[PDB]
Amino acid sequence: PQLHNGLDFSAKVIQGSLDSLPQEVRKFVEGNAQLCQPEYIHICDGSEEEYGRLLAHMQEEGVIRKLKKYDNCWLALTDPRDVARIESKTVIITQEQRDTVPIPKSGQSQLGRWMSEEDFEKAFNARFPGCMKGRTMYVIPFSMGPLGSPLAKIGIELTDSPYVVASMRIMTRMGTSVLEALGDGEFIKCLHSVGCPLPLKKPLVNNWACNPELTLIAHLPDRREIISFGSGYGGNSLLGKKCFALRIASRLAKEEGWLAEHMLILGITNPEGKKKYLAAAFPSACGKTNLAMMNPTLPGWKVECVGDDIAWMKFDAQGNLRAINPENGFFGVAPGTSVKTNPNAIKTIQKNTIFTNVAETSDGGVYWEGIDEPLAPGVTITSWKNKEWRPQDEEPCAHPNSRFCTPASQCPIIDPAWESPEGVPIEGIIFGGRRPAGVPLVYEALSWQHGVFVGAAMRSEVIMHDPFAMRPFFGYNFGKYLAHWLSMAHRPAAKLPKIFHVNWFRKDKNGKFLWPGFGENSRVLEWMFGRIEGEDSAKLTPIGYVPKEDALNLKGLGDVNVEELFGISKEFWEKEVEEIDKYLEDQVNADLPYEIERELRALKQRISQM
Numbered sequence: 001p002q003l004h005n006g007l008d009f010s011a012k013v014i015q016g017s018l019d020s021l022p023q024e025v026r027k028f029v030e031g032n033a034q035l036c037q038p039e040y041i042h043i044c045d046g047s048e049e050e051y052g053r054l055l056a057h058m059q060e061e062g063v064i065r066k067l068k069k070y071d072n073c074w075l076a077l078t079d080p081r082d083v084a085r086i087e088s089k090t091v092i093i094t095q096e097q098r099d100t101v102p103i104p105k106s107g108q109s110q111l112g113r114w115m116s117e118e119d120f121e122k123a124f125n126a127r128f129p130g131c132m133k134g135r136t137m138y139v140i141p142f143s144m145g146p147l148g149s150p151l152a153k154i155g156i157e158l159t160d161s162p163y164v165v166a167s168m169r170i171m172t173r174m175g176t177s178v179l180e181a182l183g184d185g186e187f188i189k190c191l192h193s194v195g196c197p198l199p200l201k202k203p204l205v206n207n208w209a210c211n212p213e214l215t216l217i218a219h220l221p222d223r224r225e226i227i228s229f230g231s232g233y234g235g236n237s238l239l240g241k242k243c244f245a246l247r248i249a250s251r252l253a254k255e256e257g258w259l260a261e262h263m264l265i266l267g268i269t270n271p272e273g274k275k276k277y278l279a280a281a282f283p284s285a286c287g288k289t290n291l292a293m294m295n296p297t298l299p300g301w302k303v304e305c306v307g308d309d310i311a312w313m314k315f316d317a318q319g320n321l322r323a324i325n326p327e328n329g330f331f332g333v334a335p336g337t338s339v340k341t342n343p344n345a346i347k348t349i350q351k352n353t354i355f356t357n358v359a360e361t362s363d364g365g366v367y368w369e370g371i372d373e374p375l376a377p378g379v380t381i382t383s384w385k386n387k388e389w390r391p392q393d394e395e396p397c398a399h400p401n402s403r404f405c406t407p408a409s410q411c412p413i414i415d416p417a418w419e420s421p422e423g424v425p426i427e428g429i430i431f432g433g434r435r436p437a438g439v440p441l442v443y444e445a446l447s448w449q450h451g452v453f454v455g456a457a458m459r460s461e462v463i464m465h466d467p468f469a470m471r472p473f474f475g476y477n478f479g480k481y482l483a484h485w486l487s488m489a490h491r492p493a494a495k496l497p498k499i500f501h502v503n504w505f506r507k508d509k510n511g512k513f514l515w516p517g518f519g520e521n522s523r524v525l526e527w528m529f530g531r532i533e534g535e536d537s538a539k540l541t542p543i544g545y546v547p548k549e550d551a552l553n554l555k556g557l558g559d560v561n562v563e564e565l566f567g568i569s570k571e572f573w574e575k576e577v578e579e580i581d582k583y584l585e586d587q588v589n590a591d592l593p594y595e596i597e598r599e600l601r602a603l604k605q606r607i608s609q610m
């Protein structure tokens with residue numbers, strides 16, 4: 001009801017109907033309409049028409065450019081201040097800090113950033129009131145995972161950014177079908193604003209609305225809310241991407257008995273026609289997308305992609321670890337993507353793809369560092385800063401973490417069960433990062449508990465810790481996350497996947513990679529496949545099982561330096577255990593599970609006996 005006409009926002013709806021919305025959805029939309037004061041409310045239907053028209057509108061406003069070389073491809077160049085995720089401005093709100101991060105023994109937590117309810121409410125009040133003035137508030141009903149999946153979760157994102165709408169259509173299942181399936185069911189409330197109400201208080205840079213000084217990406221797991229202000233970019237704005245997919249979802253996972261992880265999912269088939277699904281957690285810059293879409297060099301082998309970034313996994317009644325890709329597309333790093341490094345991505349991204357912060361060629365194509373493709377004489381390059389650019393300048397033509405946004409259904413090797421509601425059975429979990437020295441190409445954890453330790457001990461690159469590739473993404477206390485992983489071993493009839501650790505990045509004394517990697521990583525996956533089958537192809541070492549002599553198929557690779565590649569040094573590993581000890585003691589402290597501490601003791605002891 002109302003004594004006037006300030007609460008009913010029906011008159012400002014330009015697509016859809018508030019009356020047709022589920023009650024709790026309407027309250028979410030109208031309540032934030034009252035707060036943010038948008039000019040219009042557009043309830044998205046997810047249709048091709050809505051999509052095409054909105055892209056054309058952004059094009060006319062100069063917000064995006066059409067890439068004329070390709071089929072329905074687009075380019076956005078952002079404000080340089082709004083180029084990536086800002087961890088210092090990414091927070092999780094809970095009653096007690098200990099529930100969000102372990103209280104460190106000595107230093108500051110690097111496992112998350114807590115903000116009190118009190119401090120967030122002040123921050124919220126200083127940002128959102130009237131922030132959508134003069135703008136359309138878009139209502140994005142989206143599913144994270146196949147619509148009918150028991151592993152899927154539903155979100156509603158409100159945004160004043162058409163860039164977010166178009167990108168969410170690609171990255172999630174979006175539209176009217178989602179609302180109809182949701183009904184009076186539960187959903188994650190996602191609120192986003194670029195933080196630039198009209199009239200503009202500050203000058204617009206590169207037609208890219210953002211408020212850097214006030215940027216704040218907040219997560220409120222107990223309220224089932226994500227609230228993001230000031231940034232229009234990637235993980236800060238596409239609230240399904242990391243905020244929902246990893247931070248909120250990992251909390252839900254903890255509560256409900258499942259796992260939300262920074263993992264690719266791939267299906268691998270051998271020459272005997274046997275197929276296994278694998279998951280792998282690597283940090284940013286460590287090649288999940290390359291592995292997920294691998295073109296295998298080994299004859300008779302086939303790799304297929306379920307997902308390249310996020311895995312939602314739950315042990316079923318039969319004890320199989322069932323996994324879905326909750327995403328609907330690939331939000332891949334553009335620089336470094338070539339025919340050599342990722343040929344299947346090259347194929348995917350030439351239609352219906354949105355590019356952000358890459359360079360543009362004179363004939364309307366895309367360009368970036370490591371594209372490994374020469375241009376015809378005459379073809380010139382415009383950089384991501386909208387500047388004339390030559391191949392030999394002291395400046396990259398694309399932003400180091402510039403991205404493409406492409407539909408998953410377009411991947412030539414997309415898995416036939418990539419959107420099967422029941423998910424796919426994971427038989428192996430892979431951990432890894434960038435280690436220039438000391439860490440063998442591949443090793444296998446001795447048990448589930450050792451495997452959890454291996455994930456927890458992950459380091460990459462200055463070499464920094466990134467446990468489970470989840471350091472920027474823990475939705476709650478990492479110690480409790482470790483306990484949650486360990487508890488899976490005590491679950492009824494659980495078939496615990498084999499756990500491996502890989503290192504593509506080991507270098508010799510001259511700084512060149514000892515392993516050719518990319519397509520050649522099918523040789524590593526072959527060994528993993530065999531080990532899952534119970535093949536006697538492993539040699540026991542202090543760090544776990546490694547391939548036997550001659551176990552790894554090296555045919556066609558010439559003379560690979562295996563002794564250096566698989567070399568295990570007592571002195572390196574003595575230092576390794578020490579640094580892992582100090583890290584877990586400080587960062588996890590009182591929340592370090594007994595079994596992780598035990599695995600550290602165990603590894604320390606095995607190394608001492610070298």
Ligand SMILES: Nc1nc2c(ncn2[C@@H]2O[C@H](COP(=O)(O)OP(=O)(O)OP(=O)(O)O)[C@@H](O)[C@H]2O)c(=O)[nH]1
Binds near residue numbers: 518
């Ligand atoms: N040497 C070597 N480098 C690799 C290999 N696979 C991937 N890379 C490198 O990894 C980088 C690309 O990986 P990213 O796309 O940033 O990794 P990602 O896990 O998909 O990152 P996010 O999308 O942010 O999650 C490039 O620099 C590649 O050269 C490999 O097998 N060997």
Ligand SMILES: [Mn+2]
Binds near residue numbers: 331333
């Ligand atoms: Mn990726």
Ligand SMILES: [Mn+2]
Binds near residue numbers: 262284309
């Ligand atoms: Mn990622």
Ligand SMILES: [Mn+2]
Binds near residue numbers: 486490
């Ligand atoms: Mn136990």
Ligand code: NA
Binds near residue numbers: 206
């Ligand atoms: Na722009």
